[PDB]
Design a protein around this ligand. Structure first.
Ligand code: GLU
Lengths: 50, 49
């Protein structure tokens, strides 16, 4: 019931002095443009049984 | 009662095979943007159409 408020998304937490903090952000944006995260969404999150 | 949508998304038969129906479905976009770059890398024939 109701609308949405405090709209914030999920992320991967990493420490500040991490060498991998740049290669992860370039892989999530690449998986949103080729349709990789919509197979993961229709398999676990979207079979609406009732 | 309640109405229903005409298409289901970008993976519909009307967007992939426009010539296999009635006088073809007419869809397009404005170039020089991000949606054109997204469509070009994922669909070639649809991009040209
Ligand atoms: N926001 C797009 C332009 C608008 C669109 O493509 O829908 C861009 O900066 O390229």
């Amino acid at each position: 019931t109701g609308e949405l408020f405090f709209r914030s998304g999920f992320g991967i937490g990493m420490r500040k002095d991490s060498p991998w903090k740049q290669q992860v952000s370039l892989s999530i944006l690449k998986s949103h443009e080729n349709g990789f995260m919509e197979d993961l969404d229709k398999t676990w999150v979207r079979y609406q049984e009732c | 009662e309640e109405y229903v949508d005409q298409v289901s998304g970008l993976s519909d038969k009307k967007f992939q095979r426009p010539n296999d129906f009635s006088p073809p479905f007419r869809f397009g976009t404005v170039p020089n943007g991000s949606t054109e770059r997204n469509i070009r890398n994922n669909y070639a024939e649809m991009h040209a159409y």
